[PDB]
Ligand binder design. Structure first.
Ligand SMILES: Cc1cc2nc3c(=O)[nH]c(=O)nc-3n(C[C@H](O)[C@H](O)[C@H](O)COP(=O)(O)OP(=O)(O)OC[C@H]3O[C@@H](n4cnc5c(N)ncnc54)[C@H](O)[C@@H]3O)c2cc1C
Ligand SMILES: Cc1cc2nc3c(=O)[nH]c(=O)nc-3n(C[C@H](O)[C@H](O)[C@H](O)COP(=O)(O)OP(=O)(O)OC[C@H]3O[C@@H](n4cnc5c(N)ncnc54)[C@H](O)[C@@H]3O)c2cc1C
Ligand SMILES: Cc1cnn(-c2ccc(OCc3ccccc3)c(C(=O)O)c2)c1-c1ccc(Cl)c(F)c1
Ligand SMILES: Cc1cnn(-c2ccc(OCc3ccccc3)c(C(=O)O)c2)c1-c1ccc(Cl)c(F)c1
Ligand SMILES: [Cl-]
Ligand SMILES: [Cl-]
Lengths: 427, 421
């Protein structure tokens, strides 16, 4: 109904979005956010794709968000040799796009408040369920028909649910860390091709850069905390970059590279899985609180946004019965949120075994070959996760099946070539 | 050295054992047990080489071994009534049945045998730090207390580990498997053991499994494993009987025809939880052992055994490195995590395998096969159960050797098979 009351823990990306969806069902939605309001007072800028945009569209916020973001119509792949090689993102209609964490969070919090039946309570944190006010130890919690945990990867709500029975949970800090470095404008234009995801794929080290609107790119650098150990000196940084990423040094400030590198230390990436996502129609997790995935497919925000949407579809489908919706969310969504978590991890692993200048290209071009050969039966993985709402686990199934039929189908051509050689050679 | 204070959280199997080991190198050791003294106020488990070696280290092997029943073989109850006994590898090598309780009581008492040790019953813990907050006999008496070492031996649901979990770079995972477990008892018949008293008795259905271990009165205690699902489908005495008739037909005579009823409805199926984490320490002030560090699913009889080996390996390190906890805590994590993850894995593998590929028969084949090849090549092939039960081959190496073996067999006999045919 309308006059049930729901509290959203977290005024983040997902928290805000959810509060919009819920406000839009005429719920009374109170959003509690630890930090002070970011419009007055982790990733700097992220990749927004079909799934997230479809969630944004259900609240009539897609157009606003899309207008502040720069399109990425292709990958641009920076070889060690200096060779820049550019592969488009699937079809001509499909592109991912680069937006800013904060512009996104800000517009969303504003959208939250635009619903008169919704408040957002900045400077409120949470200890048990016990929300704090402005002054700490002002424990003035207050009850609700739904508590929605959108408190992110280090989730308080999840922490309570983890103590409950038959709750599987896991948390892995991976070997690599990330740190942000910014490419500026060169004479007031973009120093690189600005409608491209820029990748510098080495194996143990990888860099990406995503265009902003002030004509800059922000780059994240990934490498094992091991190598972060090995560059304590400005000379080392320089030497490293000269070795592994030659064309960055000119692109980035040669000297600002050193201010920005040592500005604060490499960030850890956590992976948390859990099951199930809910508790007896009084409590549910969503986004990074439910799944926190290593940032290796551009899908963490997209998936958490999609949680919000999938929920909202179940609230339509089951006329707002939380006792139905909460177990159904967990049944329907956990497979997918786990599968994207796996995809993300697979990718990260793959990217340290073998992706160099060269492999990236072969892998994608081969993918493009086979789609062009046999559409629809082969759709590349990237297309499936980035440009559709095919369920993630299904996309994994299809992606395995496809790889099975490419391997089996290659074998017979290899062997028919192998008999064809000998028969034409003898006679 | 003598000046150092240590607290052991939990006065369980591992906690009490560790407290001995520590007391025995002159620490000031205080054990804090949330329960009341079980000596005044898994019922029974499978002791083996690893545990016995740790027990030996502290002068308590003999005391414990006196009160247990040797199980010199497996005894396999097939659905038809057939009962095949496969021996444990060697006449010297047997596993033995003991009580959780008697074991826990003798260790508590041995802890108290040392003048520099105290155990503090009815004391629970709230919060700790690298200053801890233990509860008194009266709830809400939160007195602080300090120490040079805090050893988390507080079990599968470990308070101390909950604190480590919050710290950075700390990997942790919990998984409750589908099956729970229930204890049942085969009494004595006419004052004697109702079955061969020196076997581990196994009834391997797939979705349902059951084992039985002798006690010293002339009974066996059984554990029944099945999916919590099936447990839900047996609410009445009739259903339990009707089930037992289907899956474990020889039991209804063996077990009290209605002792079964008393015991099955005595209290609900208990869940089995796998927990894994890394690392096992926090920078020389704090260390996890036994189930706090590794709760494994109970399908290799190794849980207590590994936890006891933890205590032994810590002692070995404290010897090697002259009691430097700055060195031993990281070295413990470094040396022991691979092994303690390995046995966790072995345990779970075993448990999945026992839901698909062991009916009555595969158990015999697999074991007999394995026995054949040991006899053929006593050094290059040692069977799995022998390596875990009867040696201190490190768990991870045992899994290596084991995989290697499986490969040389698969390759070598696929060579005989495919080439000569
Ligand atoms: C390096 C990196 C790159 C990434 N790149 C991409 C990308 O390209 N594309 C993409 O889709 N995703 C990306 N992601 C994923 C994305 O950052 C997250 O998935 C997304 O922020 C999840 O939103 P959320 O609201 O669940 O968590 P958050 O956005 O972190 O929000 C959590 C909010 O809850 C608040 N909070 C925490 N605790 C409490 C409490 N006790 N009480 C009240 N409030 C609390 C916090 O203050 C915060 O505002 C990336 C992540 C990283 C780390
Ligand atoms: C069905 C089953 C069969 C098993 N069979 C075998 C087998 O055949 N062989 C084998 O080797 N192992 C077996 N195990 C494993 C064995 O039971 C455990 O390995 C062993 O009990 C772990 O010892 P521990 O001292 O770490 O944990 P526990 O023995 O559980 O000790 C934890 C202790 O700490 C106390 N405590 C907990 N929290 C606090 C707190 N906050 N403050 C103070 N005190 C606290 C608890 O009261 C308890 O006494 C089996 C387990 C199960 C469930
Ligand atoms: C932020 C964002 C948005 N999309 N992607 C992304 C991720 C992975 C991809 O596959 C890599 C691969 C191709 C072929 C073989 C193995 C791996 C592709 C792709 O297909 O272009 C695109 C990222 C991203 C994030 C971090 C790193 Cl390190 C990175 F390279 C890219
Ligand atoms: C308490 C205790 C002590 N040892 N074991 C044990 C465990 C596993 C074993 O391997 C099984 C297997 C044999 C052959 C092939 C696959 C698997 C063997 C063995 O080889 O005898 C013995 C148990 C135990 C615990 C739970 C169950 Cl369910 C169980 F059956 C026995
Ligand atoms: Cl991500
Ligand atoms: Cl066990």
């Amino acid at each position: 109904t309308e006059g049930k009351r729901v509290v959203v823990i977290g005024g983040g990306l997902v928290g805000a979005l959810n509060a919009c969806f819920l406000a839009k069902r005429n719920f009374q939605v109170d959003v509690y956010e630890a930090r002070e309001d970011i419009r007055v007072a982790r990733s700097i800028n992220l990749a927004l794709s079909y799934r997230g945009r479809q969630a944004l569209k259900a609240v009539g916020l897609e157009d606003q968000i899309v207008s502040k973001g720069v399109p990425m119509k292709a990958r641009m792949i920076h070889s060690l040799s200096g060779k820049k090689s550019a592969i488009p993102y699937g079809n001509k209609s499909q592109y991912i796009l680069s937006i800013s964490r904060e512009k996104l969070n800000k517009d969303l919090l504003t959208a939250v408040e635009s619903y008169p039946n919704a408040k957002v309570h900045f400077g409120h944190k949470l200890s048990k369920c016990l929300t704090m006010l402005g002054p700490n130890k002002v424990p003035r919690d207050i009850t609700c028909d739904l508590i929605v945990g959108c408190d992110g990867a280090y989730s308080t709500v999840r922490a309570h649910l983890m103590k409950k029975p038959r709750f599987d949970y896991s948390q892995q800090y991976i070997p690599h860390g990330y740190m942000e470095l910014t490419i500026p404008p060169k004479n007031g234009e973009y120093a690189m091709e600005p409608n491209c995801l820029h990748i510098w794929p080495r194996n143990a080290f990888m860099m990406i850069a995503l265009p902003n609107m002030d004509k800059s790119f922000t780059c994240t650098l990934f490498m094992s905390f091991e190598e972060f150990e090995k560059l304590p000196t400005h000379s080392d940084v320089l030497d490293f970059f000269q070795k592994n990423f030659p064309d960055a040094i000119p692109l980035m400030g040669e000297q600002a590279l050193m201010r920005d590198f040592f500005l604060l230390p490499a960030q850890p990436m956590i992976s948390v899985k859990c099951s199930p996502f809910h508790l007896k129609s009084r409590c549910v997790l969503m986004g990074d609180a439910a799944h926190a995935i290593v940032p290796f497919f551009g899908q963490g925000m997209n998936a958490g946004f999609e949680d919000c949407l999938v929920f909202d579809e179940l609230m339509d489908k089951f006329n707002n019965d939380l006792s139905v919706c909460l177990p159904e969310f967990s049944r329907f969504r956990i497979p997918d949120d786990h599968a994207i978590s796996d995809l993300s991890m697979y990718n990260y692993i793959e990217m340290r075994a073998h992706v160099n200048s060269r492999w990236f290209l072969f892998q994608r071009l081969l993918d493009k070959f086979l789609h062009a050969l046999m559409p629809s039966t082969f759709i590349p993985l990237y297309t499936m996760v980035a440009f559709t709402r095919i369920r993630y686990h299904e996309a994994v199934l299809r992606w395995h099946w496809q790889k099975k039929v490419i391997n089996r189908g290659l074998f017979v051509l290899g062997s028919l070539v192998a008999i064809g050689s000998a028969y034409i050679l003898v006679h």
